[PDB]
Design a protein around this nucleic acid. Sequence first.
RNA 1: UUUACAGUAUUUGU
Lengths: 500, 500, 64
Amino acid sequence: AHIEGRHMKRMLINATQQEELRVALVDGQRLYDLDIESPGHEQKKANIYKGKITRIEPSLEAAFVDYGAERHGFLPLKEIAREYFPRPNIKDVLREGQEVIVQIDKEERGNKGAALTTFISLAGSYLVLMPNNPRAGGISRRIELKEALASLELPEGMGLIVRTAGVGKSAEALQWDLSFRLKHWEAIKKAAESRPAPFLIHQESNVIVRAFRDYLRQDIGEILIDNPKVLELARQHIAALGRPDFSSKIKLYTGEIPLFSHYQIESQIESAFQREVRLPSGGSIVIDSTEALTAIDINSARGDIEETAFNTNLEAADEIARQLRLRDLGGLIVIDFIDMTPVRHQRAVENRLREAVRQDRARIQISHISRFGLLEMSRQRLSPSLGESSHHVCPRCSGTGTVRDNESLSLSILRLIEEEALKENTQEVHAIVPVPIASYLLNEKRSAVNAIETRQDGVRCVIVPNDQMETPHYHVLRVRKGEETPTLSYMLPKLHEEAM
Amino acid sequence: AHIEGRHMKRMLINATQQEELRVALVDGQRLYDLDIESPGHEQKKANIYKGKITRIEPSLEAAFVDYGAERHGFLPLKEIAREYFPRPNIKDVLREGQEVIVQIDKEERGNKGAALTTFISLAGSYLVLMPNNPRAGGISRRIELKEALASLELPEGMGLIVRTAGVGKSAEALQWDLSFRLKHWEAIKKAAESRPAPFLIHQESNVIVRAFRDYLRQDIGEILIDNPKVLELARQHIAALGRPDFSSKIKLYTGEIPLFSHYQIESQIESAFQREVRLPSGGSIVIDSTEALTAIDINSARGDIEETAFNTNLEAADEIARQLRLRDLGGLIVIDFIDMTPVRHQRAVENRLREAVRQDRARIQISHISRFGLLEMSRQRLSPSLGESSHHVCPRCSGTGTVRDNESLSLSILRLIEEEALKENTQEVHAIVPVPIASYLLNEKRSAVNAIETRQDGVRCVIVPNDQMETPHYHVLRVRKGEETPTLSYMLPKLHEEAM
Amino acid sequence: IASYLLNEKRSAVNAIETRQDGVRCVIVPNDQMETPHYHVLRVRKGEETPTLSYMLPKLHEEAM
RNA sequence: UUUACAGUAUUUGU
Ligand SMILES: [Mg+2]
Ligand SMILES: [Mg+2]
Ligand SMILES: [Mg+2]
Ligand SMILES: [Zn+2]
């Protein structure tokens, strides 16, 4: 019967394992957010570079940047600063080879490079400076502050935003921040004026600093840390981050029972990695990701039908909202709630979902339930998903989740063999295939194979079982007249390795 | 530049392989429909049985039937015949153990049994008899026939439908059909009156008979068959099916180059089995199936952007329409066309799709492109999809298409080991895991494992690499005090086999 | 062999590492060998990599 | 992590 407010919200930092630093927001024992960092795979979003313009595109109204990755970043027209420009075409604003101050809006995904803007933003605890453009500024829509904002001394060419954490802080306190921002900016444009033009300038902070900078509302009761050395670092991060009011709140955890286990969130953390997640009342949601989009289905538990569909869909809306966050799912998401005949049920389920994602930091947009029962929504990509970052594509099935049955596949291969055997100038065709495929072709289909060889007089069909493949994989190589060897059937895979 | 009408439409029947009988409708060399049948996995839709009512459900307004499968069929209220009933509740109409004449509307899918109706329908070449209800009848919406329908002599309690193939046939010709139907019906209700009440009554015809009964429009030029014995059978099927006008059209194929290869449809047939399908101009569609639904994405080729998105989306609409048919995709389908800024583009793409599925036999419903760029549609399930029928769930990934990385997984297991080790009365915990998982835990994580054993004084953590697993799979078994053996670590998997 | 060394003999392996302060003993199970075969390679100071234990056989293939 | 003067309610009537 979760109600926000009942239990303490806490920040649990588990840092006993070098290879995975974990930060969890927990409410009582209810995990509602997670962040995991490991050496090497450190974050690149909100780094700043000195990049040189590679190639221009009026076609796309943007241009490409060598910021120093093996792959170049993508820089849209709407993102180039009036100050960098000696509605127009991009062919008009920037030159090829031209240096420029660049920030990463979005990490590389799939094939794309990274979206960049020249409109750099510098986040502090209470403020975000946009030294590069005045057009921007204001109050966290989550909120005297109008009154205190006006009083800071911001340089003409720039605007700024008061953060959600500003709520409880005063003017002079914002200025302390506003400045550290300006310092940094000065250092930035200077560490750039003094070089050539492809290098990193500012590395975004690690997962604890980020947590502290971005996740510490007032309603965070305690920050538990399970490792002394790290804890000490944390204290310095808080102070340095201008948040004395949290010092008392940081506490070393010392139980023998590991932190995350003591607060019982380990199974909830694991739920992020599962395809199916049980709901409180017995049903579940099933999350599938596809090329286009993430699809989520909903099943009920095992009694009013109408009431069951409703209560289950409501539970699902809650669970989806957190799975979205834990899994860092982004982009298009399509939800298949159980059918409800009463329209008012449909609105209530939508509203439940709207409510449930209100605390999410990612921008989100939801629509209504379609006449087919689908709800479409979009969530902003804050960082790569669990799938991209802790998984890899199945090596068996190639992401497809299924495997063609042996006979189906065998007959496919058989037809492919015959086609090859028909081509002019063919001397042999070698089919290299999984063991059971070989079995089936050379027993169940021995006649066919025989017929092929007899119709195509003089053509050898060699079909070799290869224990180094499993089914779906195979090769059918064609051997032209004159280029055959006296190689043994079963030493044949190895021969073709230098393909295959 | 395909235009319907240019080339001959043909029916190609490939029957040289005992284990897969294939029927293709081809237009010129363009495959537009496929059907594949193999011994054993014969069709069950439109079989008729004598079933006994198992259990009733006012909750669902329907009841269950033992028609003789291991699993019982599902029989909705709207489907029970006024004649079988000695708006009400189902608790009111049928008794438990009560015999009844039952037809299969839909094959078993997943967990469901099969949807059944008592409103039996008997399809002939030109007519469909619904002996069980008059409320039904008319003209193929694809079409003197009003005038000739009236003239048949149909028994009062029953209605009938004139098929699309009726177009070119006369009255007396419908009667010839109308009767063979009535004969059959008589035989049906008689082979039922004379037994007890769980048995098969009528087995639906095989894939060639069905093809002939259901797919032979006038615009079918030739029926090629590549096997003499089968061809002879076909002749009898046509005659028996009352279609002399097709006799001249059936022709033995005799090339050495196999039929489907001569007409170049083998690669198109194969496209049905691929996740990605190239479009004429270079782009492609990618088809993913999920618990909820089938998702299709669309990519473009490598020049007006607006024009490219449009032309590609149009090509896709065509290809999707046929993939839907070839793959026998049914249920909810969601299509992610490339973004188009001009709304008129959006309508044109929708309309293209509507047009492209007009020839499909399955009922279909399309909606508009959403504000998120998605198009939702539904297609009636005519029979199981390629996925259900020629594939099986990946054995590696369990349908998920991905595999958790080794370190991620290892740390998961490590935490699970420690939890087990903490429980009262624990003597040892055995973790049985893939080779590389073992490597990582027992090297990279050897300290952790060590610490666990030292904190939990007296608890053995045995972590054994097992070459019979690959990663995601593993077992963590807990061993209580007193129940440990002196078994060797590596003979341990085998011990637990009688689990595990 | 890996199983036995890293379970039945885990203490010994541990002791070795503790007596020889600073020396890593990496023992990796390799499904491409069966028993009698094995390799024990020594890695000098300065020439170690940050290679994962189980990607280690493959590294040493260009021996081994 | 985003843009003002405004708009009213409480109050006001021996
Ligand atoms: Mg797309
Ligand atoms: Mg559903
Ligand atoms: Mg999948
Ligand atoms: Zn797989």
